[PDB]
Amino acid sequence: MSNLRHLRVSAPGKIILHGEHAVVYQKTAVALSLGLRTRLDLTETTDGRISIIMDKFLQHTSWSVEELSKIIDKVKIDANNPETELDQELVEDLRMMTSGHHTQSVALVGFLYILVKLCKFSGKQRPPSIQISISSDIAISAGLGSSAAFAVCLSASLLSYLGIIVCDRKNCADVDGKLVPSADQLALINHWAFMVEKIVHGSASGVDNAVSTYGGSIKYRNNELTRIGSGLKLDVLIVDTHVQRDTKKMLDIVRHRRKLYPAITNPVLEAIDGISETSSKILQHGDGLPTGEEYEVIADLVRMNQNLLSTLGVSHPKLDVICETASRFGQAGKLTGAGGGGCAIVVLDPDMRQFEHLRESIIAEYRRMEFKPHLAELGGPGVLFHPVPG
Ligand SMILES: C[C@@](O)(CCO)CC(=O)[O-]
């Protein structure tokens, strides 16, 4: 058969309907996967190098198998307690090693970290000679799960290539010719993706990598997960502010306001938690398109959450304008993700969903204000393995 092994994986982007920022402090979130996907090819090579390239983000970047073997030699793994948190020393070593290149630095660190750690875990003292090529539909500046989808693609591709998971046409199930990893495989994919996400933003909740891994609709709290996609089907318009914002700064804002105003900020986080719980029950127990009644509750939950997020100081004038506009059209808007920029989501009422002209009006308004509207596809699959023609 083939001289050169070749793997292909994809992972979806995401929105958070409820519980961003709160989820960092052990509260509940509700998150949904998108039709926007990150795509990764990994092939065998014979040059004794490891390389990564990513469209519109990273030029060809490589290391010798020799240099990385020396890192693997000095790396430690706990044989008794699975590393739930980062080996900060390796991270700094890797950061030092990659500072010379011309969030692309943390992407490289994240890659090397799980590569080295997965080799150590699997008892390889030397990494295999490989090339990785990545592309995405997900903009980095949008807060739609760019980094998570990248993390998940790396995790699944490396776990499989190094033989730590074996995903066969017997072991795994088929969706439209693609393979879905098993439950156990999904957990392990998710774990190593989480480690990458922690390098990108230290106090990531793990909701992002979890929804990217598993796909569909999830209720998430403190790295524990419930699938809830077998319920109401929402219609959501994504609206990008074109404002780019560091996630870490937004997290810092909330961490600070929590120290400064404990008796305000903490009850606000609890209120968000309650919104997420209520939402999760509405979505779970319903079926089909929301009625007018169900939509009004859903819209109310969205507006309450945007208000509470604004209270945490993580909104932005342009996010505000988007949500205010949503309200003028009878809709309900909130930021999704880190805030301070990025995207809002506008949950659409039953009419706006049936009738194109309604949808087109709101869309044209957001365009007139120089935002990019994009109608979300929801409920799609999580990480997938693909067959490679040729
Ligand atoms: C702001 C936040 O809640 C969502 C990031 O999209 C951070 C996290 O949960 O990792």
Author numbering: 1 to 102, 119 to 406
List sentences from the manuscript.
Mevalonate kinase is central to the isoprenoid biosynthesis pathway. Mevalonate kinases belong to the GHMP kinase superfamily, which includes enzymes such as galactokinase, homoserine kinase, MK and phosphomevalonate kinase. Like all GHMP superfamily enzymes, each monomer is composed of two domains: an N-terminal domain and a C-terminal domain separated by a cleft.
In this work, we have identified, purified and characterized, both biochemically and structurally, two previously uncharacterized mevalonate kinases originating from the extremotolerant tardigrade R. varieornatus (Hashimoto et al., 2016; MKvar) and the psychrophilic archaeon M. burtonii. The N-terminal sections missing from eubacterial and archaeal MKs mostly form the two helices α2 and α3 in MKvar and can also be found in rat and human MK. A conserved Arg residue in MKrat (Arg241), corresponding to Arg261 in MKvar, was found to be essential in binding the tail of ATP and moves inside the active site upon binding the substrates; no equivalent arginine residue can be found in MKbur or MKmaz, where it is replaced by a serine. The distance between Thr119 (the N-terminus of the α4 helix) and the ribose of the ATP molecule is ∼3 Å in MKvar, compared with a distance of ∼7 Å to the N-terminus of the α1 helix in MKbur. MKvar presents a classic feedback-inhibited profile, as well as inhibition by its own product, while MKbur, similar to many different archaeal MKs, does not appear to be significantly inhibited by FPP or GPP compounds.
